[PDB]
Amino acid sequence: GSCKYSFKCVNSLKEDHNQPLFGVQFNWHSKEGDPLVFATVGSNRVTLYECHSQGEIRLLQSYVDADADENFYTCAWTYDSNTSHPLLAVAGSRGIIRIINPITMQCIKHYVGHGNAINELKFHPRDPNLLLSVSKDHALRLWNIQTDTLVAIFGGVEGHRDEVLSADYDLLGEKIMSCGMDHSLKLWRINSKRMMNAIKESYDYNPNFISQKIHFPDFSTRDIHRNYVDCVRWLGDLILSKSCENAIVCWKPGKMEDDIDKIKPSESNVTILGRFDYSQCDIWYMRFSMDFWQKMLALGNQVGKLYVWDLEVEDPHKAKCTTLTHHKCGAAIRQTSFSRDSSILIAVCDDASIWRWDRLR
């Protein structure tokens, strides 16, 4: 039946470059009482905004890459444990990771390892120094940004056979699920003793380091989608993933009864629980999102419509979303982001516009 979350559009902005904005991330690390700030990435630009009452969106900071042919695709927030400074990582076509310190307004760290473009960046949910990058070069990479070392390279003989498009840690940060253009979804456990020893020795390194080459994932499947898989996220111990077939598939490794932590790498079974159906999202690199509490699912389509599903109902795959639409919003929505308290939902588009949707209570 009807979904319970309702939103009102209270503002819409437009950046002066008129190039597609691919990514948008709210800073979930801000303390209670500080204003909600989010970042957008598109073209060779990084922009930071501050949300206020009555739909007001204050523009705080903007950055340009010296390289005009740089094209940022994604970003991810984190913090410095020693200095309590928020940090923002950005990356894109040139395959270079940049860490920007909005407090000092400097760019503090560059990482230039990958063989090609970076498609997604994700920070470990328990260790703010461990940064995961998925790339066009068929591999994933786990960086320690406090020691400036590369902990592991997730790829090789049984890794992805084409571009890696997305990945996501589980809630407690024990395992990673990746996907890409080889139709596959692969599981990499980072709570194995090899990985656990690699992380700590990466912390113990000081110059007078070799990274751990993980060839075999702890699970793999091509049997969820029939095309490229361009976005994956964990839903507890189940998986949400999507392709160009106008559906988000909710599945789990193995048969219905199987524990995620006892799935052996040999597992040839998967179980489809259901599909979140929608329409007009068949172009590539359109990413869905969830709020912190993983109670809402948001996805934009290629003609400016914004779908929000309630994830807490008994049959989320059988319940209607609420479509958020505006007469002046017609450009493809590349990514959305909820504030930590789910009060605000921001959507960025291919025409460099920004749309603020405020939850009605």
């Binding site: 950046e15 303390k31 204003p35 705080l60 903007s62 400074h85 928020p86 760019c107 809630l171 509490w293």
Partner: protein
């Protein structure tokens, strides 16, 4: 005849709907079991968050603008340019025996013969005349003008 395939059609869909019910029940239970894992683990991360005290972000030649469709005015702030990243030149050689592989000259190429005129070359040597050893300094910093004693053949010729 036709009555028997009538019976198996009705009995089949009777038995088929019973098993769709059963699988619908199992996915229902899977979601609700999974939901308590989400609830338990998201509050672990939420309690860890309440312990930290992260600083807030604050405002600000090339500028950028952000317009709004609504009554809010246009916002302008300066555009901070990110320092370029250097992918170092890597020359790598292979043998079945082997495997082979400061800021001032970066600034020298940017504000751009030999990187240095002859009018400023001789103004440089007499500037250092205040303080053979002199011209091995200049030639290692400015190699294209020549070697160390090509550079005092240099200075002897324009002095006269």
């Amino acid at each position: 005849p036709v009555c028997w395939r009538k019976r198996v059609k009705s009995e089949y869909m009777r038995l088929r709907q019973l098993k769709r019910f059963r699988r619908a029940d199992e996915v229902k239970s899977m979601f609700s079991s999974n939901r308590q894992k989400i609830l338990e683990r998201t509050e672990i991360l939420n309690q860890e968050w309440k312990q930290r005290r992260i600083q807030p972000v604050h405002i600000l030649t090339r500028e950028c603008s952000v317009t709004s469709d609504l009554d809010f005015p246009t916002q302008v702030i300066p555009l901070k340019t990110l320092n370029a990243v250097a992918s170092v030149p890597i020359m790598y050689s292979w043998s079945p025996l082997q495997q082979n592989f400061g800021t001032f000259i970066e600034e020298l190429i940017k504000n751009y013969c030999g990187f240095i005129n002859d009018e400023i070359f001789v103004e440089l040597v007499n500037a250092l005349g205040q303080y053979d050893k002199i011209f091995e300094a200049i030639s290692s910093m400015f190699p294209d003008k020549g070697t160390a004693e090509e550079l005092k053949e240099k200075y002897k010729e324009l002095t006269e």
